[PDB]
Design a binder for this molecule. Structure first.
Ligand SMILES: CC(=O)N[C@@H]1[C@@H](O)[C@H](O[C@@H]2O[C@H](CO)[C@H](O)[C@H](O)[C@H]2O)[C@@H](CO)O[C@@H]1O
Ligand SMILES: [Cl-]
Ligand SMILES: [Hg+2]
Ligand SMILES: [Hg+2]
Ligand SMILES: [Hg+2]
Ligand SMILES: [Hg+2]
Length: 263
């Protein structure tokens, strides 16, 4: 049951005025492609808050990567799902090395040393790399059953240029005439159920490749792309959500740089 929204005052959407004229804002399977200017965050915040939405954010920090946790968590506190319930899950081999980061109310962090726990604790799972930092708003506009993010190095590339696994012997194989986008494995998510279905499929496909003596060109990312090709994501995030300013600068097509690589 979804309760009614309250009275809200905002600019009337204009049917005869395109949102963005420089980019594709919806996929051929009618999934929104999230760019700045396509959403009214006030309306979305209302919708998700009325549902008491809890977002889980998972990150793996192994070896030297534990050094990136402080900046990652501190910036997440400033830009990630602010106003909503957030549960951070830090998977690490160095529990005592996790920094003591001050969290806002309604946000918690669990350290798992390296399940069904996710199903009873959060509504959505967001899986990202730790050697990153939030620089701008990353909110409920990304929440949906299953989402992938456009890799910043291929959003303007033709499918034949995509670095998909091209060997038929691999379960992640995608021929030159197939493919919608090249998604980056550093930022994906969705409902707990869909994320677990994805990781389960990826894990099984990789086990098969291993038994066949083959390793996908870009490992898990290759399998993620194969999965999202056959199971279309319900939302696709623009490169605003996964950028590298040092390597790619700041193109006009990006009104905001929200989540970036750490120089
Ligand atoms: C323009 C260009 O080709 N730049 C490349 C980056 O794409 C590349 O980033 C890697 O990309 C692969 C997939 O092709 C994986 O996503 C990998 O995780 C990325 O690091 C970098 C690093 O190889 O090299 C150039 O910058
Ligand atoms: Cl991840
Ligand atoms: Hg718009
Ligand atoms: Hg995850
Ligand atoms: Hg995997
Ligand atoms: Hg995967």
């Amino acid at each position: 049951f979804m309760v009614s929204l309250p009275r809200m005052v905002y600019p009337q959407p204009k049917v005869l005025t395109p949102c963005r004229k420089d980019v594709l804002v919806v996929t051929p399977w009618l999934a929104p492609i999230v760019w700045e200017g396509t959403f009214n965050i006030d309306i979305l915040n209302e919708q998700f808050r009325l549902q008491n939405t809890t977002i889980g954010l998972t990150v793996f920090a192994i070896k030297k990567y534990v050094a990136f946790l402080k900046l990652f968590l501190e910036t997440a506190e400033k830009h990630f799902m602010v106003g909503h319930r957030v549960h951070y899950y830090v998977f690490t081999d160095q529990p005592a090395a996790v920094p003591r980061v001050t969290l806002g109310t309604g946000r918690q962090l669990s350290v798992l040393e390296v399940e069904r726990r996710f199903l009873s604790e959060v509504d959505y799972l967001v899986c990202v790399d730790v050697d990153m930092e939030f620089r701008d708003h990353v909110g409920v506009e990304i929440l949906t059953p299953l989402f992938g993010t456009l890799h910043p190095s291929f959003y303007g590339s033709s499918r034949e240029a995509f670095t998909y696994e091209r060997r038929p012997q691999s379960q992640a194989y995608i021929p030159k005439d197939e493919g919608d986008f090249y998604y980056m494995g550093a930022f994906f998510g969705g409902s707990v159920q869909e994320v677990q279905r994805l990781t389960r499929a990826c894990h099984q496909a990789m086990m098969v490749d291993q038994a066949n003596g083959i390793e996908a060109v870009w490992h898990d990312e290759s399998h993620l792309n194969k999965y999202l090709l056959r199971h279309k994501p319900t939302k696709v995030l623009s490169p605003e959500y996964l950028w590298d300013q040092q390597l790619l600068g700041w193109p006009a097509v990006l009104r905001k740089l929200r989540f970036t690589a750490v120089p």
